[PDB]
Design a protein around this ligand. Structure first.
Ligand code: A1H2V
Ligand code: A1H2V
Ligand code: 11A
Ligand code: 11A
Ligand code: 11A
Ligand code: 11A
Ligand code: 11A
Ligand code: 11A
Ligand code: 11A
Ligand code: KNA
Ligand code: KNA
Ligand code: SHV
Ligand code: SHV
Ligand code: SHV
Ligand code: SHV
Lengths: 87, 30
């Protein structure tokens, strides 16, 4: 077991592996910081959008007049406004 | 100068149409 631990530490001690584990822990912490209660409607909307996109077997000008597209892009711009808040 | 040439690309046009269909699908009235 001493040899096994020695091999493990000598291979892991590279800065790449330590950085990888540190960033995995940081990713877990940040995902914990991110609030997901509000993210469930976003996930449902993403599901509907992916379904619509895969349903499709001068576009932007016609799309901007679409009320659904207008409301959706207004939602994305509200998202954009919310991020980077002055606080 | 890249966007003006890209918009005429049929592949880019179809791909951005797919992204706009995705955008339409999300936030659906339901
Ligand atoms: C007297 C009346 C004269 C005419 C009177 C006017 C004639 C033209 C009318 C307006 C046409 C565009 C309207 C606005 C389109 C929608 C808003 C917009 O701008 O949306 C940008 C977006 C680019 O996509 P984005 O990258 O922004 O996508 C976002 C993210 O990136 C996604 O992830 O859509 C486009 O560009 C589509 C329009 C393409 C260019 C339009 C002009 C080309 C021809 C002009 C000259 C024609 C001959 C003139 C001859 C003289
Ligand atoms: C009489 C005829 C006169 C000329 C006749 C007309 C002369 C000009 C012709 C039209 C040029 C742009 C066409 C439309 C380009 C594509 C549609 C568009 O608009 O796409 C926006 C996008 C920005 O990227 P986005 O951020 O939207 O990307 C999306 C997401 O963000 C990604 O994630 O592409 C651009 O802006 C590229 C064009 C740059 C500005 C064009 C005008 C500059 C010069 C004007 C004056 C010139 C001298 C005039 C001298 C008088
Ligand atoms: C004359 C230009 C025709 C463009 C057709 C673009 C695709 C329309 C159908 C989209 C789909 O449901 O797959
Ligand atoms: C004479 C030019 C008529 C253009 C009509 C375009 C219809 C297809 C638009 C693409 C789509 O419906 O997704
Ligand atoms: C309108 C200027 C302030 C809005 C952006 C503030 C958030 C960016 C910096 C966030 C941070 O320092 O962690
Ligand atoms: C009316 C055009 C004057 C010359 C502009 C040259 C730079 C155009 C933008 C090139 C780029 O975006 O890399
Ligand atoms: C006289 C100006 C000619 C411009 C041609 C630009 C060609 C390169 C465009 C960038 C790309 O092909 O991805
Ligand atoms: C002023 C319009 C001249 C004809 C342009 C035809 C191609 C328009 C762009 C179609 C596309 O983006 O797939
Ligand atoms: C066109 C106005 C309705 C489209 C947007 C509806 C979805 C946003 C709200 C979703 C929710 O309440 O969970
Ligand atoms: C000036 C009248 C002819 C041009 C109107 C085109 C409207 C197209 C649209 O509704 O997207
Ligand atoms: C008015 C004719 C000269 C300008 C046409 C430029 C077209 C460029 C392109 O196809 O992206
Ligand atoms: C007569 C054509 C006017 C410009 C149309 C541009 C577009 O909507 O793609
Ligand atoms: C009066 C001429 C209007 C041309 C622009 C049409 C549009 O982009 O929706
Ligand atoms: C003569 C130049 C007309 C404007 C061109 C703008 C562009 O496509 O970058
Ligand atoms: C008639 C002059 C057309 C200039 C615009 C060219 C383009 O952006 O594709």
């Amino acid at each position: 077991g001493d040899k096994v631990l020695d091999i493990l530490v000598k291979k892991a001690d590279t800065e790449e592996t330590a950085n990888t584990l540190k960033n995995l822990l940081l990713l877990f912490g940040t995902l914990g910081m991110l609030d997901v209660k509000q993210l469930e409607p976003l996930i449902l909307k993403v599901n509907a959008g992916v379904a619509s996109a895969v349903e499709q077997k001068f576009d932007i000008i016609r799309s901007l007049k679409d009320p659904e597209i207008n409301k959706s892009i207004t939602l994305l711009f509200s998202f954009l406004k919310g991020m980077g808040q002055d606080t």
